[model samples]
Structures are given as C-alpha cells and as structure tokens.
Target: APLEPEYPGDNATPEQMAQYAAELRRYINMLTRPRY
Candidate 1:
C-alpha cells in the first residue's frame, strides 16, 4: 500500500521491517493460493 520503508523512513526498524516482510509474504501466498 505505502511506498515501502524508503531506506530510512518512519517506524523503519530492522525488526519491524522483517515482521512486515514476513506478513507481506504470507499475504502474497494467500493471494496466489489455488482453489480446490
């Protein structure tokens, strides 16, 4: 949605970034899931 961390933006901590990336990956996985 937003324009990513932007190198050093607000609330852009390593831990937060990792958490965001993980959650984003999970969301992407859900979006690409095949329906039975």
Candidate 2:
C-alpha cells in the first residue's frame, strides 16, 4: 500500500519507536494473513 507510514527513524522518542515496532509487527501479520 502506498499510504503506509514511513519509519520514524532516529528523531522519534523511544516510546514512539516501540509503538512503531508494534505497528510494524501488525503490518507483517497483515502480509502473512491467509486469503481464501
């Protein structure tokens, strides 16, 4: 999807990085989901 957010990079706070990591995991899950 073209609309996916870019990585927050070094400027982001540690908390924001952690949150983004969680969101990144969700996207990975989305990529792996089964489609029947």
Candidate 3:
C-alpha cells in the first residue's frame, strides 16, 4: 500500500516544497498509471 503524504503547511521551506511536489506527482502517477 502506498503511504499517505503529509502537507508541509503554509510555512514550508524550499526543500519541503520540492519534496511535497515530488510526493504529489508520484501519487498522481500511481493513481493514473495503467496496470496490465
């Protein structure tokens, strides 16, 4: 099972923002990818 992502909050640092974006993109890809 995929782990749920946590929001970095409004005061997130640059590193956290990048990490969060990566997590979100990964999650979206996981959901949208085709499985055969």
Best by lDDT: 3
Cα displacement (angstroms), candidate 3, residue 32, comes to 0.5
Order of quality (TM-score): 3, 2, 1
For 1-36, candidate 3 gives per-residue lDDT tens digits of 457577758448768878887888898889877776
The C-alpha local distance difference test score for the whole of candidate 1 amounts to 0.59
- C-alpha RMSD for every candidate: 4.8, 2.5, 2.4
The lDDT, on a scale of 0 to 1, for candidate 3 is 0.76
On the 0 to 100 scale, the lDDT of residue 22 in model 3 is 82
Query: Which candidate should be chosen as best, given TM-score against the real structure?
Result: 3
* Ranking of predictions according to lDDT: 3, 2, 1
For model 3 the local lDDT of residue 10 reads 49
Which candidate would rank higher by TM-score, 2 or 3? 3
Off by over 4 Å in 3: 1-3
Q: What residue pairs clash in candidate 1, if any at all?
A: none
- Model 2 Cα lDDT, one tens digit per residue, 2-24: 23545767548768877777777
- lDDT of model 3 at position 1: 41
